[PDB]
Amino acid sequence: VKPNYALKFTLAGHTKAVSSVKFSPNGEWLASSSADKLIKIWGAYDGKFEKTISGHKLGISDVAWSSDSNLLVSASDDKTLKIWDVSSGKCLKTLKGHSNYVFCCNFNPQSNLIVSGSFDESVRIWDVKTGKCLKTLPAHSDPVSAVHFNRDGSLIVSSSYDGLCRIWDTASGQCLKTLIDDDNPPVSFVKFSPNGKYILAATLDNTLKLWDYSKGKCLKTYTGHKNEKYCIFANFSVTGGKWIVSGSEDNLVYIWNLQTKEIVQKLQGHTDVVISTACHPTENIIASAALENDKTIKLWKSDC
């Protein structure tokens, strides 16, 4: 079986590169962040623009939703994160403390914590209610490209240009595991699998790898796309067939069969690096978004 993703909507309106797109956990919305300093919210099923959220002083590199779909957190070149009330558009808190661009961010499932990574080579864990920085982890020796909580929030995975993926204990802040491979190419993206047993890691040698992080074994590799320069989001697609989904520097979305590692589809239509993809929580829908020469988000749908 192969999916048959077809283009349904192109969402225009950002005036600079789009940096990240994420579906709300309840499925109703897509949020996008951009180098144009804005977050935009779009209807996930009709592509209709809903609203613009503003207040960062420089461009945004990431955005993430709380579990109840009511809050967003954004990570900006202005060295802060902001927590937003989606319904009002209001900035509830500004998280200050990183000393360089904030690159990546995520809520835990409970959504009482935010995790961030930054060009300042640290990982920070913040209290959502108060905005206080609870812990600063001296996590890496180079910019931190991704941070993600596992399904019960007890672990954080982090990746960095220093070539390392690390697993952290949320409560204690200690490093539980360091993953290294080959000649330590920069690690540009990492995230846990939905069941929390694996991590998917991108490296800037045109390669994605699925790891059993506790056993420290590489179970799968996904290749054939182009990824040498940018921190491109990748995804597990689980609503239909079990796929790996990633953007690419050759302007395509790649979809692989997770078990066989074969490419099952390439989605054409963007005109710049596809920096970000996201998979809808219940329907076979992909969101994709691209950099400066494109500036659009595309919504794709498959029968499987």
């Binding site: 940096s19 951009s34 180098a35 420089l58 661009y101 240009y161 320069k229």
Partner: peptide
């Protein structure tokens, strides 16, 4: 701009 939209 934003760091993620710039190449390394």
């Amino acid at each position: 701009g934003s760091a993620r939209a710039r190449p390394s």
